[PDB]
Structures are given as C-alpha cells and as structure tokens.
Design a protein around this ligand. Structure first.
Ligand SMILES: [Mn+2]
Ligand SMILES: [Mn+2]
Lengths: 403, 303, 7, 583, 47
C-alpha cells in the first residue's frame, strides 16, 4: 500500500543490522543467514526497479545499516611478510561473509546510483568519518571487496563536492604511510584507478595542489618493492598528467631517473616500459631537456647483461616516433649511445640481443654516417682524469699534518 | 705435498655453514678451481655405490642444513645432487657456493649434476641474478657461477644400474652412449637432447607429448620401460618436479621423482625427501619438513 | 602455481 | 693548490657522474676537513655542504653520517652549532632512511651543546622542524625533544612541551604515529608533576585516536608512564584509559595490552593488578582473535608468579585455572603452542597436590597433541615438574607418555626426549633405567635420521658419567660394537662415532681391551667413508692409550691406510700420524 | 584393437622426431640471420 510500505522498509533495515558469524562458527545459523540474505536481496530488487522510495527518513537508516555491516577491523594478514615473499604469489584468502557483504555493497550502490538520490540531504550522514572508515576497508584481502569499494568511493567522490578535498588528503596519507613506513597495503591499485579517473576530470590551468601530488606522491610510489602489483595503473596516472600539462615532463622523467632500480630487474623492465609510454607523448621541446640523462641510462640498459633489460631497452628502436626524435637530435644522442652497444657487438652470451645490437648500430649510422671511433680517445681522457684524481688525494692526505 | 689450500677451503666451508657468502675474489677463485675438476668428469658420471640422492634445493639454505641433519654431514655421507641449486629461495648465493665448495674439497664424496635452473637465462628471470646483485653490487659472481654451470655433468650412473638426471628422457636419446657423445660445455640450448634431459617430465599419457613447460617433452610408461630395458637400468631417478610427499613413484616404478626443497618458495606446503642407496643398493626415502625458522630494507635504487 | 617453469 | 684547494677537489668529485665516486668523497670528508683549517672547515666547507649540495638519497645518507662525527673538526663544543644547518636540511628530506640518520646525528651532537647553545641554536631547530610545511620535518622533530629538554631553562621547557603537544595533535596520522612513539622517551625526561598534568592528557588523546595504528602506540607509552608514577595517581589517570585499550574494537590494540601485560602488572603494582588486571586478562584469554589469545597465553605463568602473596591462591585457582583448561583445547595450533611452553612453570606455584589434581591431566592432553609444536614445547620444561611432584609420581603419571614420544613421528620431538634422557635416567637409577629404558636408547642409535643418531651418541657419554664405566662395559659397549657388522655403512660409522665418545670416560683399560680391536678391524671396510673415519677415530682415542699399544698396534694400521687408493682416507691417515706424533 | 595402438605408437616416434628436426632447423636459420645481420653492419660501416 501507499504508506505502511515506508515503515516496513525501515523495519527490515533494522533486521539487517544483525551481524552473523561465518568464520568462528561456520555451521551455525544457516537458516537465519538465509533470512538475512533474502531480506536484503529483496531490498535491492525493491530499490532497483521501483522509484520515489529514497524518502528523507530512510537515509540514516541505510548509512547505519552499511556501517554496522561493513566497518569492522580487518583480521591479521593471512600471508607471510618479509623480503623473501612476492605479494603477487600470495594465496587468495577470501572474505567468508561474502554471502551478506556482497548484497550490502550491491545495495548501498543502487542506493547511490538512483536518480532520486539527494546528495545535500545524505551529506549529513555520509561524512568525513564515514569516508575514513570506508578508506580503511581498501586494505581488505578480498579482491571483490576492493572492487566494490573502488566503485563506491568513486561515486561518493563524484556526488559530494564537500568531501572531495578530504578524500584527496586522506588517500594521500594512506600512500605516504605505504611508501615511507610499511611498504604493505592490498589496495594500492584500486585507489590509483579512482585517482586515474580523477586526474582526467582536472581543470585547465592545472592547480598547484595536484602538481605537488604528482611530484610528491605518485612519483615516489615508484620506489617500493611491490611495484608490479599496481604499476599499470600508476603508469596510467602519470601519463595522464603529462597529457594534461606538458611542462611537468622534466621533473617526472628526472624523478624516474632518480629512482632507477639498481638491484631489481623486473622493475627495470617496468620503468623502461613506462618511460616509452611517456616518450609517446613527449613534445619535442620537452624532449631536448631530458635526452642526455635519459640516454645515459639507456646506454647502461642496452649494455645490461640481463636479457630482459637489454631487450626492452633495444625495443625502443622499433618506435618510429622515438626513432625520429633521435634523428633530429643525433648530434647529442649518438656519442653517448655508441660506446655502449659497440662494447657488446664483439661478443654476447645471448644471441637474440646480439642480433638486436647489430641492428641498432645499423640504424644509428643510417642517421648520420659517424666513423667517430674517437671512442678510445675518450678512454684515454678518462685515464688522465684518473691520474689527476689520485695525485690530488696525495696532496690532501699529505696536508692532514695540519693547521 | 702441501695442504695450505685445504686449510683455506675448510675455512670457506665453515663460513658457509654459518650462511655467510664468500667474497667476489673467493668465488672467482672457487669457480676457477671447480672448473678444472668438473671438466674431467663425464656427461654420464660413474658414481660409487653407497650414496644419498637429492632433488631440487633452490636457495633454501636452511632447508639444505635440515637435509644434512637428516642425511649426515657432508664428508661422512656421500651425496649426489641432481641440480637446481639456485632459484626461488632467499639464499641462492650461500647454497650454490657451499655445494660447489664441498665438491672441490671432496670430489669423491659429492657429485653435483646440472639442472634446468643452472643456466644464464633461467637464472635471470628467477631470483639468482638479482640476489647476486644485492649481495655483491655487480654481475661478476653471476658471471663466474654461470660460466661454471656449463661444466656440470648432465647425468649420473650409480653402479651401472640407477640412472640419475634432473629432467627426464629425450626422443633424440636411446642409450647412455648417445649421452656420452654430446658436447655439454655450453648454455642449455632451447631445443635438443641436452635440453630435454634437463626439462622433460614423465606423465600418464603413455608416449611422447608436448610439455606444458615451454621445453622438453612429456613421456609415459612405455618410453621408461624401453629405455630401462635397452640400457639395463633397474630405475630412472629424477628430480625436477614438485611432489607433495617429497618423493613419488610412477611408471610401474621405472622412475622416481625426488624433491628436496620443503615448502617450496616458502609457499607450496610440500614435504621434501632424499633417497639413500646403501652398500647393496637397497633404497629408502627420508621425508622431512622445513627447518624451524627462528628494519625497513635498503631502497632498491641504492648501489 | 607461481610461474609453468615450477607451486 | 692553496687554502681552499681541498674544497675544489670535493666540488670536482661531486660533479662526477659515477655516484660511487661521489660516495668515496663523502666517506673521506674528515680528511678534507683536517686538510683545511679548523676555521676553513667552519666558515667554508660547512656552508658548502649546506647550500651547495643537491644529490641522490644515497649521498645525502652518507653526508648525514659524516656530520654526526665532525665536532672536533669544526673546533669542538664551542662550535657544534655549525653542524646544525646541514642537518636541518637532511632532516627534511623525503626518504625515511636519510632523515633518520639525520636525527640520529642530531641527537648525538646535542650532548656537545652548552645549555646556552641548546637554547640559541638547537631548540630553534626543533621548532622549525616541528612547525615545517611537510610531515617529514615534523616526524623528524619527534626524535629530538628528549635530548635538549633536561638541560634548558624552564621557559624553554614550557615551549618544548607546547610543541610536543602540537605534534600529538597533527592533522596527519604520520606525525601522530611518530609522536606516540616518542611519548614514553619524553615522559622519562620530564619533571614528575608535568608527567601528571601534561603527559597524561597527551596519552589519553592518542589512546582514543581514530586510527588504531596510533592507539596501539599509546599502549607502549602507558608502560613508561605507569613506571614513573605511584599507586594512587594510576587510578585516576592512566587506568580508565588502560581498561579501554583492553576492550578496544581493534585486535591490534588489544594485542599490545596482552603483549605488554606483565610489564603493565609490575608498573601498576599488586593492588591495581588484583582489581583491574585480573578481569582484563581473563577476557584477553577469551578474545575472539587468536593472535590475542596466543599473546596472552605466553604470559600465563609470569602473571601468576607476580600476583600478591595473599590472594595468589584464590585468584589462580578460581579465576585463571579454568581459562587455562579452556585454552588447552583451543582450536588454534599457535595459542595452544604458546600455552604448552609455559604451563609447566605453574607447578611450583600450585604445589604438589594441586599440580597432580589439576595440572597433570592438562600436561597429558598436551603430551598427546596432534600438533608437533605443542608437544615439543611441553617436553621442554619437564624437570621443573619433577621437582614439585615426586620422581616416583613422575614415572607413574608421565613416564608412559614420554616413552611413547621417544618413538614420535617427527624427529625434533624424538630429539627433545633424547636430550632429557640423561637427567631423567639419573633420577630413576640404573636398575630401573636399564630394565625399562635401555633398549629405547639403543634403538635411537639405529634411527633413520642422522641428527637422532648423533644425539643418542653423546647421550651415551652422559649416561656413563652417572652409571660409571662397568655398566658401560656390560650394557652399552657390546651392542655398540655389534653395529660394526651392519650391512649399511651409515650405521657402521655409528660404531665409530660411539667409540669416539665413550673412550673419553671408560678409561684406558676398557678402551684398549674392548673397543680398539673393533676399530682396527674396520680399517679394512669396503667403503672409504668408514675407512677415513677409522683414521679420525684413532686420532681421537690415540691419547687415551699406552705408547706401547699406540706403537705396535695403531701406527702400522694408520700407515697401511696412508697407502689407501682413496684421497680422503690417505689424507686423514697422514693427519692422525702428525697429530699423534707417529710421523 | 592391438595394431591400432601399435600404429599410434610408431606414428609418434615419427612426429616427435620430425618436430625435433624442424626445431633444429629454426635454430640453424637463426644463425644464418645473425651472421647476415653482422654482415649488414660491417658493410654499412664502410659507407
Ligand atoms: Mn627443474
Ligand atoms: Mn626446480
């Protein structure tokens, strides 16, 4: 009927606040679990297809229903921690109460997505406090939970201008702790996906806050060991900023150079891959600023004994656009690239990359015939620089007898 | 007749038993000494009758220590290791260098074969290369060890009867003499008999078949039975495949898989095993669990 | 189950 | 080369592109300084390292370390404040490890500051850091308060307290975390009625922080706080906050309480323990979270052992004991594991009759637990029980279960029993031992795992030390030698390893007459491993023998082995001849 | 029922041996390619 409907709805929300045990006692309460399962199941179908039911009083009743079900302390990690473990190889440990949890998530989402949903009426209840406890949940081990949370926080970000600043500051805090204190968190990817979409939304003359956020938060996310878990979405966030404002490219490329892995190969491949995507958007003007430091690295990589590092580097040559930026800058780039791939032409343990360095050397001479083997001319300038060095230290030490 | 060097070796070994790496110039010297003894060993090494035979180890030093607790100390009991000393564990440097160490001090007491992880390529995609890098600061020790892996015999023959190898059988191989005729002094090729021997797996599909690993072949009972009958072998003993009981019979007992890394990569939860061949070549297996395992790291962009 | 090349 | 030549060289070296070369410069930075004046160090090198240095985190890390040791180089304590500008910058650096060294270096040199300098230079540094734009500067500041405070004027002390208070109430949890970290450290340095009036409020606020990562750090602080303070102040102040943490919604918080529990019991003293800490502990042993239950279990004997002399019986027997019984059959391997490793230490506390009545069935259920770790942890401390109940009682109640565990499936359990045998046998006596326990020990020598064989071997030496050499001759020796004909070389060597050990304490006669002959026959064993151990073994027992025996019997055999076809036999023979001086 | 299995048997030594032969051939062709790549390089050096 036209009304006692609104009373019966609230009544059922109440009954869905009864938490059930799925872990400690896994065989208990089968019947009543189903009752709850059915109770919120129908409440989805109810609010989904019908309309004009998100009335003023049901708001607090819903938010409270969510909180009591969703906001718990996460249990101890089910995975070993330590330097000898790759979090990629962690056994998927699932949230045992997913029977109910899914439908609370699915519900609160439809509750959000309704075109009859009134933000500045709900905002009394979805507050900073709610957001913070929602943000805590991203460290859940269950990927399905993280998935829902991603979408939920993404909506909340969209529909509450009041909360946008807070949400930005809070996830920043989460990262800082991850990068600088613990180096463990299960939900880095998901938070970055939200952030990716957020980066696109940003406004024309990029605001200082966000520039800082790229340089101080997103770049250092690069230094943590478990980069593979969230690198794609991290790389995306970075690339988007560069599309939004090209003047950011020197600092970001200089940063990636600063953080270059010296003892972690998969990360070396990861960086090489990310940098190429960056070069795929580089305005020539911004390219001239970073070529030399960039290629002093590529030199190191090309001569790397690690076939996956060498390969990925050498694969830069199959990029028409990069290859042309090399071409009309050949003056500067070639004397630094040449020694590297020359030392590795005489011989190599790996035949494939042997093939690739022969090809690479070919493409360089076709750019500007450079019979410039005053390569060994530098190998002497360096012998002399070392003799001046050792003869300087002599003077300093024999001046220790001092005043 | 001076044993100045065996004092030096005894020290290196003692050090290694305390899970402490040797130095760059010590590994280099060690490998140099190791090469000269391995080079004179056959593609199919003749191994004397009482031995204890072991599967994969993959850098799990503390479990190797555990192995010796079950098996006996590394001079008093003879050992034969079927390769795979270096990858997924946290202590590949200490493990391979210890095992090589033992071989040069006691060439007669220990034999070490090549596994599929003793190779430049495999050692780069899995831990060892990065381990060497964070423990030494350069790629030299890696260069010395990989150069040294080319010299490891491919297969062993215990008492003309128990054929020992890392992988399994090869379609290009029908006899031991086919094996003796190979040139092993090289990187493990992507195809061919040398490769199959380090890569293949037995299975339940009674014939040659495509390996789910990108290399070697699968092979069923009938190959094993022919291969054994043709060579007068009572058993093929092999070691490249995780088994949850640490050891596994198959092919009407023509082959055994032995696997010596308990709870592999500290993830897999498997038992480990080794097999003792006594004076009269009777066998017995010993299973064992992983040994009782009793700041913020340096940034990976440091060096 | 870590990666076919072998948990 | 003139006055500032050493600085020019440094500049050149930091202009280098090999990061490694730049490092070597920084490592040799005290040689630069010595080369330079003391005053050129101050007025030129120091400013250079302050302004004119931009570089990688690894270099900044080295510079931090160097600067912590420069006091003399800069002219001594009159001049330490020169070092502060460089160090303030490094304390601001993003990378955790660099700013941490910076703090470490700052703390070190503070002690070289006169109170005037602490007031004019160091304290201002702490203010700037604590009020800086970024959380890195602020976290660094938390580490610096307790080194300047005790040595500055009260007005400055009032300021340090304000700043510390502001950090405790930062907008970011990063700083709040780092603050709560240094709260106890700081408290230990305050005058006591400032502890009461200003630290308690700080502690109370952190203990109810929204982030549980902050809250659990306040528990650590509560210990330092309670230890500075006497029975009466605890009740008003720290106690209502402490009682909350034990019921915190976060198991992470409840865990600290449990982990710090005895330390809390001391600090608080027996009166409040009785009223407040007894119910709390019970609830912690009943936590929904197993890590909490495990943590609490570890403390069961400590807690009980520190209860006041009067109510000790009532509380243990009525409050704690039934929890322990419940915990014995907990679902979780690890909480059961923790308990098993401390429960037996309860025995001297309940005394003979109580132990037999209540503790004993528990021990027995743990002696037969399915989890090997439980049963390993419960063997550990058996003697302590033998001291409270009789040895008579022991062999009636527990011996049968011990005998069962001598043949346990897991060898570490087997070993636990072996290492306990010598003591236990001593207490039962020889006529009992070698009627009921001899064969069991002999079987160990023939066990599949080496370690077990090994252990059972030295065990032999311990036995002969309490039963004497003629029990050995009649009971041990002949079974040991019987092993020299085992078809397996692995068990044959056991015979040698046993002789190695037994010779040390059976004396010349028995060794020569009854052991040596077996060793010498083994010199002809088909397997090299046995052969070179005959050499090692002759080396070892050589000194025990008369020079005539050594000379007519041992020497020929060792020499025969130096002619052996096998390199290791030849080596160990040559070795034995050197050592025994028969070469 | 017998000869059928027996046929599949011979058919498999056959196919495997062949696979192994073609695999051999890709590797030999790869060596030709590496040599030629080297030659293109040496020749373009003298342009
Ligand atoms: Mn393998
Ligand atoms: Mn393996």
């Amino acid at each position: 009927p036209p009304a006692d409907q609104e009373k019966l709805f609230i009544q059922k929300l109440r009954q869905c606040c009864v938490l059930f045990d799925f872990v400690s006692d896994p065989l208990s309460d089968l019947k009543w679990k189903e009752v709850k399962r059915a109770a919120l199941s129908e409440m989805v179908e109810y609010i989904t297809h019908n309309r004009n039911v998100i009335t003023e009083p049901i708001y607090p009743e819903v938010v409270h229903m969510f909180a009591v079900n969703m906001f718990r302390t996460l249990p101890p990690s089910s995975n070993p921690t330590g330097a000898e473990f790759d979090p990629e190889e962690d056994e998927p440990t699932l949230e045992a109460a997913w029977p109910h949890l899914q439908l609370v998530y699915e519900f609160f989402l439809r509750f959000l997505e309704s075109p009859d949903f009134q933000p500045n009426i709900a905002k009394k209840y979805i507050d900073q406090k709610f957001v913070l406890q929602l943000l805590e949940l991203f460290d859940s081990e269950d990927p399905r939970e993280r998935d829902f949370l991603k979408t939920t926080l993404h909506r909340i970000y969209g529909k509450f201008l009041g909360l946008r600043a807070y949400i930005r500051k809070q996830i920043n805090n989460i990262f800082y702790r991850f990068i600088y204190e613990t180096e463990h968190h299960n939900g880095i990817a998901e938070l970055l996906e939200i952030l990716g979409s957020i980066i696109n939304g940003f406004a024309l003359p990029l605001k200082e806050e966000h520039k800082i956020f790229l340089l101080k938060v997103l770049l250092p996310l690069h230094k943590v060991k478990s980069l593979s878990v969230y690198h794609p979405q991290l790389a995306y966030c970075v690339v988007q900023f560069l599309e939004k404002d090209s003047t950011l490219t020197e600092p970001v490329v200089m940063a990636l150079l600063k953080y270059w892995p010296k003892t972690h190969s998969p990360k070396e491949v990861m960086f090489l891959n990310e940098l190429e995507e960056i070069l795929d958007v580089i305005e020539p003007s911004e390219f001239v600023k970073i070529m030399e430091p960039l290629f002093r690295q590529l030199a190191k990589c090309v001569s790397s004994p690690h076939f996956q590092v060498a390969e990925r580097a050498l694969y830069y040559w199959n990029n028409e656009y990069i290859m042309s930026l090399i071409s009309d800058n050949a003056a500067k780039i070639l004397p630094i690239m040449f020694p590297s791939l020359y030392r590795n032409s005489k011989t190599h343990w790996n035949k494939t990359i042997h093939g690739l360095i022969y090809n690479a050397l070919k493409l360089f001479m076709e750019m500007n015939q450079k019979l410039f083997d005053d390569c060994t001319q530098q190998f002497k300038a360096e012998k002399l620089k070392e003799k001046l060095k050792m003869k300087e230290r002599e003077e300093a030490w024999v001046k220790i007898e001092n005043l | 007749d001076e044993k100045v060097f065996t004092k030096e070796l005894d020290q290196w070994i003692e050090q290694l038993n305390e899970c402490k790496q040797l130095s760059e110039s010590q590994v280099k010297s060690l490998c140099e000494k190791a090469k000269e003894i391995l080079t004179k060993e056959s593609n199919v090494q003749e191994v004397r009758c009482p031995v204890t035979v072991c599967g994969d180890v993959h850098g799990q030093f503390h479990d190797l220590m555990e192995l010796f607790r079950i098996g006996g100390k590394s001079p008093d009991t003879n050992y034969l290791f079927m390769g795979d000393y270096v990858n997924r564990g946290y202590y590949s440097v200490e493990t391979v260098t210890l095992l090589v160490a033992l071989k040069v001090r006691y060439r007669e007491r220990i034999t070490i074969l090549r596994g599929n992880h003793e190779s430049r390529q495999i050692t780069q995609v899995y831990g060892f290369y990065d381990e060497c890098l964070r423990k030494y600061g350069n790629a030299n020790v890696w260069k010395y060890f990989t150069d040294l892996f080319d010299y490891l015999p491919l297969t062993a023959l215990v008492d003309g009867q128990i054929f020992c190898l890392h992988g399994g059988l090869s379609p290009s191989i029908d006899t031991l003499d086919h094996i003796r005729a190979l040139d092993r002094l090289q990187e493990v090729p992507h195809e061919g008999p040398m490769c199959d021997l380090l890569w293949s797996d037995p299975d339940d599909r009674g014939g040659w078949g495509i390996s789910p690993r990108g290399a070697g072949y699968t092979f069923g009972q009938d190959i094993s039975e022919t291969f054994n009958h043709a060579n007068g072998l009572t058993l093929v003993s092999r070691a490249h495949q995780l088994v949850m009981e640490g050891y596994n019979w198959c092919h009407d007992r023509n082959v055994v898989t032995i696997f010596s890394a308990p709870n592999y990569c500290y993830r897999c939860g498997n038992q480990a095993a080794i097999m003792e061949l006594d004076d009269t070549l009777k066998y017995s297996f010993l299973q064992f669990d992983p040994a009782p395992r009793r700041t913020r790291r340096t940034p990976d962009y440091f060096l | 189950x870590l990666x076919r090349x072998x948990x | 080369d003139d006055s500032l030549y050493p600085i020019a060289v440094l500049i050149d070296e930091l202009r280098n592109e090999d990061v490694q070369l730049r490092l070597n410069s920084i490592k040799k930075l005290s040689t630069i300084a010595l080369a330079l004046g003391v005053e050129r160090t101050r007025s030129e090198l120091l400013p250079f390292l302050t302004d004119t240095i931009y570089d990688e985190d690894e270099v900044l890390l080295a510079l931090a370390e160097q600067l912590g040791t420069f006091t003399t180089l800069v002219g001594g304590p009159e001049y330490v404040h020169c070092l502060l500008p460089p160090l303030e910058s490094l304390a601001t650096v993003e990378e955790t490890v660099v700013r941490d060294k910076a703090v470490e270096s700052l703390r070190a040199i503070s002690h070289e500051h006169s109170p005037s300098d602490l007031e004019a230079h160091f304290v201002p540094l702490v203010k700037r850091l604590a009020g800086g734009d970024w959380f890195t500067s602020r976290t660094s500041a938390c580490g610096l308060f307790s080194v300047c405070y005790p040595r500055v004027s009260s007005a400055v002390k009032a300021e340090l307290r304000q700043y510390f208070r502001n950090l405790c109430s930062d907008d970011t949890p990063m700083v709040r975390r780092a603050a709560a970290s240094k709260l106890g450290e700081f408290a230990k340095v305050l005058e006591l009625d400032n502890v009461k009036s200003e630290i308690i409020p700080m502690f109370s606020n952190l203990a109810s922080d929204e982030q549980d990562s902050v809250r659990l750090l306040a528990v650590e602080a509560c210990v330092n706080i309670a230890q500075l303070l006497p029975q009466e102040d605890l009740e008003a102040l720290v106690m209502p906050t402490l009682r909350q943490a034990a019921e915190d919604k976060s198991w992470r918080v409840r865990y600290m309480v449990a982990d710090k529990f005895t330390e809390l019991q001391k600090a608080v003293g027996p009166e409040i323990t009785k009223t407040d800490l007894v119910p709390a502990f019970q609830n912690l042993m009943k936590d929904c979270e197993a890590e909490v239950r495990a943590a609490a279990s570890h403390k069961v004997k400590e807690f009980c052992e520190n209860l006041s002399a009067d109510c000790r019986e009532n509380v243990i027997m009525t409050q704690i004991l039934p929890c322990i019984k419940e915990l014995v059959s907990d679902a979780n391997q690890h909480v059961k594991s923790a308990l098993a490793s401390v429960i037996m230490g309860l025995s001297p506390i309940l005394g003979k009759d109580n132990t037999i009545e209540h503790l004993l069935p528990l021990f027995l259920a743990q002696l037969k637990d399915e989890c090997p770790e439980v049963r390993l942890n419960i063997i550990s401390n058996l003697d302590c029980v033998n001291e409270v109940i009789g040895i008579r009682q022991l062999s009636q109640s527990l011996l049968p279960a011990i005998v069962e565990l001598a043949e346990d499936a897991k060898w570490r359990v087997r070993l636990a029993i072996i290492e306990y045998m010598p003591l236990l046998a001593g207490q039962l006596g020889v006529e009992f031992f070698d009627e009921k326990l001899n064969s069991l020990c002999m079987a160990w020598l023939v066990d599949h795992v080496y370690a077990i064989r090994e252990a059972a071997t030295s065990n032999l030496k311990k036995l002969v030390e309490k039963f004497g050499k003629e029990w050995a001759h009649a009971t041990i020796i002949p079974k040991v030698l019987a092993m020299s004909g085992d078809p397996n070389y692995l068990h044959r060597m056991t015979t040698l390893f046993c002789i190695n050990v037994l010779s040390e304490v059976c004396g010349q006669d028995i060794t020569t007459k009854h052991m040596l002959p077996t060793v010498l026959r083994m010199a002809g064993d088909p397997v090299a491993n046995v052969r070179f151990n005959v050499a090692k073994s002759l080396q070892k027992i050589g000194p025990i023998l008369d020079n005539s025996t050594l000379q007519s019997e041992v020497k020929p055999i060792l020499e025969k082995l130096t002619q052996d076809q096998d390199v290791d036999v030849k080596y160990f023979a040559q070795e034995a001849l050197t050592v025994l001086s028969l070469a | 029922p017998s000869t059928l299995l027996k046929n599949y048997q011979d058919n498999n030594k056959m196919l495997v041996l062949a696979l192994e032969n073609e695999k051999s051939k890709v590797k030999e062709a790869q060596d030709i390619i590496l040599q030629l790549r080297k030659e293109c390089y040496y020749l373009t050096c003298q342009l």
